[PDB]
Design a protein around this ligand. Structure first.
Ligand code: CLA
Ligand code: CLA
Ligand code: CLA
Ligand code: CLA
Ligand code: CLA
Ligand code: CLA
Ligand code: CLA
Ligand code: CLA
Ligand SMILES: CCCCCCCCCCCCCCCCCC(=O)OC[C@H](CO[C@@H]1O[C@H](CO)[C@H](O)[C@H](O)[C@H]1O)OC(=O)CCCCCCCCCCCCCCCCC
Ligand SMILES: CC1=C(C#C/C(C)=C/C=C/C(C)=C/C=C/C=C(C)/C=C/C=C(C)/C=C/[C@@]23O[C@]2(C)C[C@@H](O)CC3(C)C)C(C)(C)C[C@H](O)C1
Ligand code: SF4
Ligand code: SF4
Lengths: 659, 86, 225, 73, 169, 131
């Protein structure tokens, strides 16, 4: 199609991986095969990422020196080869005659060290092997493409005599879309047997590497101590091995649940769902499966974010002031993204996958939810309003009283429920000890109570927006016929009072801001309590403490990184602090100023180009005629700028303050 | 191009036709309603997607619907002036 | 005059198909195990009016039950609240009332007789800690005895579960477990008089047991305790 | 004869996409012509988003209901 | 480990304010700041008298708050939210009175709306009826429970708009 | 003769009813009618007349209600005994910490409690089905 504008690129890039929207993707067979191949390529990318990390650790870094003195030493991420740096004098990242290096804040050093890596040769062998695994993944993608092509050819060449041969149309993608066998093998082999295999790895490599004296592998390597070994300040490796052994056994047992290879054994998921409380749903729906997987991944990512910090599993990881914060924040952000992703894909499932029954029929869980979506949304709004009103009001009361200089006048509600739960947990742990757990129990005060209620507000409002989008995706009082329109469309016009941000994609756009806010609140809470436990406990009850003792006070090293006096190793962090501020501010433009103004401006610019003497005779403007970004395109671009600035301006701050 | 559809709830008041900026719509004889006429959309290729017909529709929910199709944008639906795709 | 609307032209009202009932398709809902939850109907207050129990103590008579808070009408109200039978029928309320009356009638005399007498082999403790002591020190005969008591209670409860009484569609009369070994009351008049007497004594025992517990756990709340 | 509801009587709207779905309006008039798909005319005291007070419904989209009470829509 | 410890009074993270060194130090510092600010102005000044009043207010506040619990580390009075009524700085009394007042406001309002049932009355308030409803809203707990029980509070969901259509008609 | 809106609606209703019956029938083939999709697996109807069938119990559909009840009660008793003995009345944590092995009886026994629960729901289902 030669007739095109510059919006062509953005329209394509917004759905490059929306395989269901592809032209000439006739059937679910094509859809599933394309998705499988994309998955293989994704695994190849992950393996190449692992191989690159390992290679750079081996070559550009100091793993061998670090493992000798892990406590004061700092791992190297990779060298800096940037021509723009000053050549007259040494940079802050060099030893005045040495290649510039970057410190590593990913904990991969601790990971390798407690896995059992002793020499750079082992890291090199791993780099090589993971590259080979990437090759294997790509070749498997090719193999499966060929096998599925060979089945289509067969079905074309051979036909059942009876007219029911068309029934085979449904079973061509059975290997990719079968649920019982996939569940059995995933939960039994990919999870349980993988855990058992890692137990074997620990017993064979990690335990001997950690233990100075040689001792034959035996049940003595399996223990149920708890807490952190004093020397490494981490969970006993012997306990990790038992842990994984136990989980592996349990999940290997659970992996015989469904009928996978024969119909003589196992039960059916259709049958469980039919007989259970949830009536039934489109288990075949790829969007629904993606939503469930994303929800599970989000909860697991949050769990690891909390537990890696609480119970240190890696040698000397706790000693690394910066790496702990970086890991927690990283996995918290990933978890938030995965949660909002699950919600967005549930909305998409409702839009284009769910087969709604007739209105009066109420047989499925989704229909039952749609019956009282109004009640759900109203109650969620009530909870959000209560939390916001009271949290903000108590914080403002404390703010005003502190500003007037009377801390005694502050409202300080003791967290009695959380303290009782914590005391019960401590009682259980003390009983176990009589038969250390660091950071699993924390002082907990009224400031913690207020911050927890703020985080609850954030979660409730995010879920409010996402649930409203999902439950109004098919229809709404303002736009009853929303099923016909795509998942994301600009608007419905200025009629009916105006219909800005009326689509389910627009609800996601809105919930993205909240996710970022609630995640920022969580990260600020963790970082403040981590940096200054005592000051946080005493002063975190009013917002001026957050604005002064946390942001303004700890912002000094970052902004002072590079100045008229000189530069230090945080100069890069200071430049990325400002670059990300600028990106956020740019996102404000696409978020505030909308398309008509920019289309008219583009028209004027195009007029100028067409009136320019030399340029007109070469460039007509007919092909890829410039245009202003569409409404949805600009919404997304502004959201991307906002998200990039917000997310990327934090790591510089945390590194500066914790380093 | 966009898709302009008309449903039998139409009462033939002609407000959509009068609000059309590029004359996409026209009233046609019918027996479904008392006015004995229903708006049609023969020239949907000229529809720009302004939803002024939708704004002017009286019925409880619109008897005329404009579905936007950004993938099938043409110069007529984009209102191109400085550049020509013809 | 009205022109008879044909069936195809007849509107299908939404109120005729509540959530608790199968829709126009007519497919039965998922089977329920605790009971066969049939289509509930509003009859709680009428059943309460018909039921025995009110006699001049609160200045009331049969057909005029004592219910200042109207907890018996909440079953009828749940039809307007959700369409989900969240609040129990007066049948379930009477079943629970009779169960509590019998349990408390046993419990009060049990408290007094535990204060007075005792059984060898069982731990010595007050009425407010005897069960906890037995649970904590199962040895000799207390473990077997408490196992017997728990098994008997669970078997009786399972055998005489008030099926569908939550909806009021219970086949048997509330509290009519059939336990009449001596056949003391058989006639309808005698049955009604004895039902009223049992309800009165059970209410008195419930109040006495609550007074005992509250007086013990708040020393000055009740004079006797 | 009168095919639809009586003039002036209250009818509950059963059109799911209607702004007044499941709420009641007053039958302004009914078209007796058999060729009218949506003869009944119902007016409501609550204007919809387009500030429209009345609408036309088919005989199967309206059922007879009592007049709204205090605090009822 | 004991039922006695259920009370917030018997907690290891709190102490009586009159016996809290941090609380005493904070108040002593507030008093010192107020006195230092007062010393700037002349002795017989109206501002001097106002500062004397403020110092008296601070001392009375210290005396009143001495009974309340406060954390050992910071020594700021705490608000008990367990549900214990007979405890200083209990949340139940303010909670109960606010709930009564808020229900009063809501009931009054709902009653005006039910009685009027007209946008014209909503815009131009019928002040007599509004005042009557405001006065009548004092029995809102009993009135609301009675209406809930008798079915005059909530209407069946089939009588109100459910929302947008999620399926084909 | 003129086909009025009422006549068109009548045609629509008759078409809907008849063709819906046809689609339910075996003459219409759709991807949603495969095994594992909406329809029950052949020969194993889980729910009939709004009541669980014996097939919901899988391999226990041939067990009588009486023996199912006995098995559920026995499993409940044994599992509860094992759980209480393991947790409170015969703790094993101290012995294991000393170095001894668990009482293998308690671990295998304790699994019977959830098995007992599901065996009761199966006993009720079988009894409710007249078996
Ligand atoms: C062309 C672009 C493209 C690309 C690059 C990918 C990439 C991916 N897709 Mg795919 N996908 C695509 C298009 C694409 N997809 C399209 C168009 C569709 C149709 C909607 C899908 C539908 C789809 C589904 C349905 C799924 C994927 C998944 C994946 C992953 C593949 C395997 C992998 O490496 O996982 C690496 C992942 C891990 C190492 C993490 C494993 C842990 C999982 C994710 C969570 C398990 C939770 C469990 C169910 C519950 C725990 C309970 C507990 C809390 C108690 C990867 C992120 C899978 C995935 O992981 O989704 C999140 C998946 O389930 N995709
Ligand atoms: C500091 C900025 C700010 C503030 C104060 C609020 C306040 C609110 N937002 Mg949020 N919101 C913000 C920025 C902010 N938003 C941004 C930047 C966006 C992106 C466009 C959104 C997008 C958004 C959406 C999409 C929704 C909210 C909702 C809410 C409400 C949450 C409940 C609550 O706290 O009630 C208490 C009220 C306050 C704290 C406001 C102060 C009241 C006085 C001064 C006390 C509330 C009115 C949700 C809502 O309406 O819930 C009912 C909702 O759905 N907001
Ligand atoms: C920091 C935030 C930010 C930024 C960067 C801009 C930028 C711009 N706005 Mg503004 N704008 C903002 C916020 C911002 N806006 C907000 C929040 C709103 C909403 C109220 C608006 C609303 C708005 C309107 C309505 C208009 C503008 C206009 C403009 C343009 C001014 C002229 C110009 O481009 O000269 C300066 C350009 C820059 C400073 C951009 C950065 C250039 C850097 C320093 C050099 C680049 C180096 C190198 C080549 C980069 C290569 C990178 C690559 C290799 C990866 C410019 C694109 C006007 C316009 O377009 O006029 C023509 C205009 O009409 N803005
Ligand atoms: C939990 C025990 C219990 C239960 C389930 C019932 C149930 C019933 N009683 Mg009540 N009743 C009880 C205890 C109980 N009673 C006690 C202890 C007394 C003595 C004061 C009475 C005295 C009494 C009389 C005199 C009458 C009833 C009647 C009724 C019926 C209608 C009222 C109702 O809905 O009650 C439902 C009750 C509850 C759901 C209990 C809720 C308790 C709240 C939540 C706590 C209050 C505790 C309190 C301060 C002590 C109903 C079958 C009337 C009747 O026979 O109608 C046919 C009737 O006339 N009862
Ligand atoms: C026919 C049924 C039956 C039988 C055979 C027994 C038999 C026994 N019960 Mg009894 N018991 C029964 C019903 C029965 N019980 C019921 C229904 C209850 C609950 C209402 C109890 C509650 C009970 C307790 C609480 C105790 C006994 C105990 C005993 C033993 C006491 C010695 C004796 O009976 O002389 C004996 C094994 C005692 C025991 O275990 O002695 C070793 C004991 O402590 N029983
Ligand atoms: C959520 C758990 C749950 C569920 C779904 C059921 C379901 C059932 N139980 Mg119950 N039951 C439970 C817990 C549960 N039970 C527990 C914890 C016990 C104590 C050991 C029992 C003890 C028990 C007995 C003794 C009996 C049942 C029976 C039954 C069946 C008829 C309903 C009945 O009489 O219930 C009434 C009893 C209850 C405890 C209701 C619990 C309702 C939950 C909390 C909701 C039904 C399949 C009967 C049956 O047919 O057995 C074959 C029967 O005789 N159950
Ligand atoms: C889920 C949280 C929760 C809930 C719902 C309650 C509920 C209650 N608590 Mg609280 N309580 C909590 C956590 C909670 N508590 C915790 C964590 C502790 C440990 C510090 C306590 C310790 C505690 C005490 C010591 C007392 C309460 C009391 C009460 C009652 C307050 C209302 C009242 O007086 O009713 C009854 C009406 C009069 C009520 C039963 C008080 C109570 O029952 O007073 C009578 C009371 O004495 N609570
Ligand atoms: C979550 C609860 C649950 C429920 C309600 C059911 C229900 C059912 N399963 Mg079972 N099943 C479960 C879990 C469950 N299963 C699990 C976890 C697995 C994996 C091991 C299986 C694997 C499985 C298969 C392969 C088959 C069934 C079948 C059945 C049916 C007959 C059950 C029977 O006869 O049990 C009574 C039998 C026993 C109690 C003996 C079980 C003994 C083995 C070793 C399993 C016990 C493992 C234990 C719980 C975990 C050990 C953990 C470790 C730490 C020691 C019935 C529908 C059969 C059927 O008809 O399917 C259509 C069938 O073919 N199930
Ligand atoms: C770096 C760390 C910090 C930052 C983290 C990243 C930022 C946060 C993520 C953004 C938040 C939203 C994420 C959701 C994504 C899907 C949304 C979507 O498709 O809707 C985006 C929508 C999709 O498009 C719409 O689709 C609708 C159908 O649903 C209709 O057809 C609409 O008309 C159509 O506009 O809008 C767009 O088309 C957006 C325009 C996209 C333009 C991008 C072109 C430039 C790309 C350069 C960057 C390279 C890209 C590869 C990245 C490499 C990474 C390895
Ligand atoms: C709290 C308190 C006080 C009090 C009090 C009050 C008012 C207490 C009241 C107590 C009350 C009212 C106690 C009734 C008991 C009834 C029993 C045990 C009946 C059993 C009956 C049984 C076990 C069986 C009966 C059968 O008929 C059945 C069912 C069927 C027949 O075939 C067979 C037989 C005949 C066997 C003080 C002292 C005033 C002050 C102080 O502060 C403490
Ligand atoms: S063009 Fe923009 S402002 Fe106008 S209705 Fe659409 S989204 Fe709203
Ligand atoms: S959207 Fe605008 S141009 Fe298109 S038919 Fe409607 S009124 Fe005419």
């Amino acid at each position: 199609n030669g007739r095109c504008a510059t919006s062509r690129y953005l329209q394509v890039m917004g759905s490059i991986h929306d395989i269901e929207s592809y032209f000439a993707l006739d059937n679910t067979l094509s859809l599933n095969l394309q998705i499988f191949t994309a998955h293989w390529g994704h695994l190849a990318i992950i393996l190449m990422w692992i191989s690159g990390n390992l290679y750079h650790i081996a070559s550009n870094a100091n793993y061998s020196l670090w493992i000798k003195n892990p406590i004061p030493s700092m791992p190297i991420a990779h060298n800096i080869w940037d021509p723009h740096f000053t050549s007259s004098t040494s940079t802050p990242y060099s030893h005045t005659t040495t290649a510039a290096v970057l410190i590593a804040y990913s904990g991969i050093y601790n990971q390798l060290y407690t896995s059992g890596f002793s020499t750079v040769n082992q890291i090199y062998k791993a780099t090589f092997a993971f590259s080979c695994l990437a090759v294997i993944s790509i070749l498997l993608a090719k193999i499966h493409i060929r096998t599925h092509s060979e089945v289509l050819h067969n079905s074309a060449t051979h036909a059942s005599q009876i007219p029911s041969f068309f029934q085979l149309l449904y079973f061509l993608d059975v290997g990719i879309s079968s649920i019982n066998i996939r569940l059995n093998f995933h939960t039994g082999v990919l999870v349980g047997f993988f855990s058992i295999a890692y137990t074997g790895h620990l017993l064979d490599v990690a335990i001997p590497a950690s233990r100075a004296p040689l001792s034959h592998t035996s049940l003595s390597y399996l223990t149920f101590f708890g807490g952190l070994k004093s020397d490494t300040a981490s969970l006993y490796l012997t306990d990790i091995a038992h842990h994984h052994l136990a989980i592996g056994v349990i999940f290997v047992y659970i992996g015989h649940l469904y009928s996978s290879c024969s119909t003589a054994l196992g039960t059916y998921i259709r049958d469980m769902l039919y007989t259970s409380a949830i009536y039934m749903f489109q288990i075949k729906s790829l969007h629904l499966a993606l939503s469930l997987a994303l929800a599970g991944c989000a909860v697991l990512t949050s769990a690891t974010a909390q537990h890696i910090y609480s119970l240190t599993p890696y040698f000397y990881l706790s000693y690394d002031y910066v790496t702990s914060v970086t890991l927690y924040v990283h996995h918290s952000y990933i978890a938030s993204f995965l949660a909002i992703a699950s919600h967005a894909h549930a909305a998409i499932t409702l839009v284009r996958d769910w087969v709604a029954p007739l209105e009066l029929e109420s047989s499925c869980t989704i229909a039952r939810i749609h019956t009282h979506k109004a009640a759900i949304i109203s109650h969620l709004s009530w909870v959000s309003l209560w939390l916001g009103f009271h949290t903000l009001a108590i914080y403002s009361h404390n703010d005003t009283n502190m500003a007037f200089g009377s801390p005694s006048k502050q409202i300080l509600i003791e967290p009695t429920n959380a303290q009782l739960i914590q005391e019960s947990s401590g009682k259980a742990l003390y009983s176990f000890a009589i038969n250390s757990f660091g950071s699993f129990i924390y002082p907990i005060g009224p400031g913690d109570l207020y911050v927890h209620h703020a985080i609850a507000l954030g979660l409730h409002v995010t879920v409010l927006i996402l649930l409203k989008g999902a439950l109004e995706a098919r229809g709404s009082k303002l736009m009853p016929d929303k099923m016909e329109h795509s998942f994301g469309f600009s608007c419905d016009g200025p009629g009916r009072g105006g219909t800005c941000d009326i689509s389910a994609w627009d609800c996601f756009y809105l919930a993205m801001f909240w996710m970022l806010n609630t995640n920022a609140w969580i990260d600020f809470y963790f970082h403040y309590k981590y940096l200054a436990p005592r000051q946080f406990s005493e002063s975190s009850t009013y917002l001026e403490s957050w604005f002064r003792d946390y942001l303004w006070f700890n912002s000094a090293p970052l902004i002072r990184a590079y100045s008229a006096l000189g530069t230090n190793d945080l100069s890069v962090q200071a430049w990325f602090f400002l670059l990300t501020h600028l990106a956020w501010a740019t996102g404000f433009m696409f978020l505030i100023s909308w398309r008509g103004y920019w289309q008219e401006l583009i028209d004027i610019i195009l007029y100028m180009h067409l009136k320019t003497p030399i340029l007109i005779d070469l460039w007509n403007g007919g092909v890829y005629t410039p245009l202003a970004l569409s409404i949805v395109q600009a919404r997304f671009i502004g959201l991307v700028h906002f998200t990039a600035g917000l997310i990327l301006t934090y790591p510089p701050f945390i590194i500066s303050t914790t380093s | 191009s966009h898709a302009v559809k008309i449903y039998d709830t139409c009462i033939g008041c002609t407000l959509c036709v009068r609000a059309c900026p590029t004359d996409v719509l026209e009233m046609v004889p019918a027996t479904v309603n008392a006015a004995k006429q229903v708006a049609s959309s023969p020239r949907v290729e000229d529809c720009v997607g302004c939803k002024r017909c939708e704004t002017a529709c009286p019925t409880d929910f619109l008897s005329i619907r404009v579905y936007l199709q950004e993938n099938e944008e043409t110069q007529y639906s984009l209102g191109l002036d400085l550049a020509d795709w013809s | 005059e009205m022109a008879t609307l044909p069936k195809h032209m007849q509107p299908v009202d939404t109120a005729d198909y509540p959530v608790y009932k199968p829709g126009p398709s007519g497919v039965p809902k998922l089977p329920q195990l605790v009971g066969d939850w049939g289509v509930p109907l509003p009859g709680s207050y009428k059943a309460c009016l018909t039921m025995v129990g009110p006699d001049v103590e609160t200045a009331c008579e049969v057909g005029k039950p004592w219910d200042p808070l109207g907890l018996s009408k909440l079953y009828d109200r749940n039809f307007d609240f959700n369409g989900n039978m969240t609040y129990p029928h007066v049948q379930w309320l009477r079943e629970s009332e009779l169960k509590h009356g019998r349990c408390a009638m046993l419990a009060i005399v049990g408290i007094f007789a535990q204060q007075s007498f005792h059984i060898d082999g069982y731990p010595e403790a007050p009425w407010y800690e005897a069960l906890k002591a037995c649970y904590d020190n199962p040895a000799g005969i207390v473990g077997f005895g408490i196992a017997q008591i728990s098994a008997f209670a669970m078997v009786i409860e399972g055998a005489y579960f008030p099926k569908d009484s939550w909806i009021g569609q219970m086949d048997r009369e509330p509290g009519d477990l059939g336990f009449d070994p001596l056949k003391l009351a058989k006639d309808a008049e005698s049955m009604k008089s004895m039902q009223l007497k049992e309800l009165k004594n059970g209410r008195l025992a419930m109040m006495a047991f609550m007074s005992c517990v509250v007086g013990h756990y708040v020393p000055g709340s009740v004079p006797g305790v | 004869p009168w095919v639809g509801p009586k003039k002036g009587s209250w009818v509950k709207v059963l059109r799911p996409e209607s702004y007044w779905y499941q709420t009641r309006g007053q039958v302004v008039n009914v078209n007796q012509k058999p060729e009218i798909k949506y003869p009944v005319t119902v007016k409501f005291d609550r204007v919809n988003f387009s500030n429209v007070n009345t609408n036309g419904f088919a005989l199967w989209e309206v059922i007879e209901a009592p007049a709204p009470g205090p605090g009822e829509v | 480990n004991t039922p006695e410890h259920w009370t917030i009074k018997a907690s290891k993270r709190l102490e009586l304010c009159k016996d809290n060194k941090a609380y005493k130090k904070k108040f002593k510092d507030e008093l010192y700041k107020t006195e230092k600010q007062q010393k700037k102005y002349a002795t017989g000044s109206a501002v001097y008298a106002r500062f004397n009043k403020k110092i008296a207010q601070i001392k009375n506040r210290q005396e009143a708050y001495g009974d309340r619990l406060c954390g050992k580390q910071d020594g700021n009075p705490r608000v008990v939210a367990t549900g214990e009524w007979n405890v200083r700085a209990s949340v139940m009394w303010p909670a109960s009175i606010f709930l009564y007042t808020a229900g009063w406001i809501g009931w009054a309002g709902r009653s005006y709306l039910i009685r009027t049932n007209d946008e014209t009355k909503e815009l131009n308030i019928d002040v007599p009826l509004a005042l009557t409803c405001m006065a009548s809203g004092f029995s809102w707990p009993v009135a609301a429970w009675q209406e809930i029980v008798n079915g005059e509070m909530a209407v069946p969901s089939s009588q109100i708009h459910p929302g947008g259509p999620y399926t084909q008609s | 003769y003129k086909e009025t809106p009422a006549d068109e609606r009548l045609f629509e209703q008759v078409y809907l009813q008849y063709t819906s019956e046809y689609m339910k029938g075996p003459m219409y083939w759709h991807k949603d009618k495969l095994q594992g999709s909406l329809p029950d697996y052949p020969g194993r109807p889980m729910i009939r007349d709004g009541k669980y069938t014996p097939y919901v119990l899988g391999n226990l559909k041939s067990f009588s209600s009486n023996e199912l009840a006995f098995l559920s009660m026995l499993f409940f008793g044994v599992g509860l005994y094992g759980n209480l003995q393991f947790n409170y009345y015969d703790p094993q944590w101290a012995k294991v910490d000393a170095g001894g092995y668990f009482n293998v009886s308690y671990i295998v026994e304790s699994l019977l409690l959830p098995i007992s629960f599901f065996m009761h729901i199966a006993c009720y289902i079988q009894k409710q089905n007249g078996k």
